[PDB]
Amino acid sequence: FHSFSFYELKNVTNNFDERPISVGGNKMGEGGFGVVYKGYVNNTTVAVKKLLKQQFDQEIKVMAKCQHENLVELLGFSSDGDDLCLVYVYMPNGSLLDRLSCLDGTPPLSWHMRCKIAQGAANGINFLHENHHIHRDIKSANILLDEAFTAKISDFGLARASTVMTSRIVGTTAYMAPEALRGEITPKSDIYSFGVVLLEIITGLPAVDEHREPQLLLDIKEEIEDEEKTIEDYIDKKMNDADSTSVEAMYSVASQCLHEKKNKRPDIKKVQQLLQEMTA
């Protein structure tokens, strides 16, 4: 890794220019954790995530021995200055969540591209588990896309090494498995979360929408099993290259990932296979 000076990162981001890139600024994203500014360091654009001290330490401890094509890469950090910073490789295309909703006018993702993104994300989760790590916050917004739209799992601040139980329940409600919501800590929960992500990919719909029926995306699975609604009713209409065969196949994996009984769910390796056999 590599340490950085605070100002160093301040000057690189045009002095923490919180104005969006489309208007001429250096601001890429916000919410929670903090703002992520586009930096220019030696022609090497980076992602300056400015900020809790335990999570700043975890991300760096995890990024330490988990290097893979489908995981964001940690370049450096800044421990000096006021707010703590983290430097990752720059992810041009943002999050899968923002691309599924065509934020700022970006073109809808083709079905073909979505299949590769699902594959890439699964290979990422797989790597994390083979290394006995549990993400705990697998979701659409935590899947970033690079120039070639390669999926990269991000945000390891809540990540854990490894079934145990915790008193401090964390994650995102709309993506959380039953046992996870009760405080259980297990890789089986990442699979469930990924299942919700596969539904986002298929339908282009956000995990939760108050003005909607159902309000939680995960429940459309019951509407489909109760044959009161079909998968075709939910397929994202902002595509024209999605063959019914592989769409149903991805839905099959998604349905399996969303099984209420954590022991009834397939493991990541199985998820990898099915997704692979889906495009084969």
Curated annotation (Swiss-Prot):
The residues annotated as the active site are D137
Gene Ontology cellular component terms for the protein in this record: cell surface; cytoplasm; cytosol; endosome membrane; extracellular space; extrinsic component of plasma membrane; nucleus; plasma membrane
Q: Which residues carry this modification: Phosphoserine?
A: S167
Q: What is its EC number?
A: 2.7.11.1
- What cofactor is needed? Mg(2+)
What keywords would UniProt list here? Acetylation, ATP-binding, Cytoplasm, Disease variant, Immunity, Innate immunity, Kinase, Magnesium, Nucleotide-binding, Phosphoprotein, Serine/threonine-protein kinase, Transferase
Q: Does the keyword Cell division apply?
A: no
Q: Which BP terms in the Gene Ontology apply to this protein?
A: cytokine-mediated signaling pathway; innate immune response; interleukin-1-mediated signaling pathway; interleukin-33-mediated signaling pathway; intracellular signal transduction; JNK cascade; lipopolysaccharide-mediated signaling pathway; MyD88-dependent toll-like receptor signaling pathway
- Identify the residues that the record assigns to the Protein kinase domain, covering every copy: 22-275
- Output the PTM entry: Phosphorylated.
Subcellular localization, per the record? Cytoplasm
Tell me which domain of life the UniProt entry assigns to the organism this sequence originates from: Eukaryota
Q: What does this protein do?
A: Serine/threonine-protein kinase that plays a critical role in initiating innate immune response against foreign pathogens. Involved in Toll-like receptor (TLR) and IL-1R signaling pathways. Is rapidly recruited by MYD88 to the receptor-signaling complex upon TLR activation to form the Myddosome together with IRAK2. Phosphorylates initially IRAK1, thus stimulating the kinase activity and intensive autophosphorylation of IRAK1. Phosphorylates E3 ubiquitin ligases Pellino proteins (PELI1, PELI2 and PELI3) to promote pellino-mediated polyubiquitination of IRAK1.
The record describes its quaternary structure and partners as:
Associates with MYD88 and IRAK2 to form a ternary complex called the Myddosome. Once phosphorylated, IRAK4 dissociates from the receptor complex and then associates with the TNF receptor-associated factor 6 (TRAF6), IRAK1, and PELI1; this intermediate complex is required for subsequent NF-kappa-B activation. Direct binding of SMAD6 to PELI1 prevents complex formation and hence negatively regulates IL1R-TLR signaling and eventually NF-kappa-B-mediated gene expression. Interacts with IL1RL1. Interacts (when phosphorylated) with IRAK1. May interact (when phosphorylated) with IRAK3.
Q: Which family does it belong to?
A: Belongs to the protein kinase superfamily. TKL Ser/Thr protein kinase family. Pelle subfamily.
What pathology is it implicated in?
A: Immunodeficiency 67: An autosomal recessive primary immunodeficiency characterized by recurrent, life-threatening systemic and invasive bacterial infections beginning in infancy or early childhood.
Name by which UniProt lists this protein: Interleukin-1 receptor-associated kinase 4
Naturally occurring in which organism (per UniProt): Homo sapiens
Coding gene? IRAK4
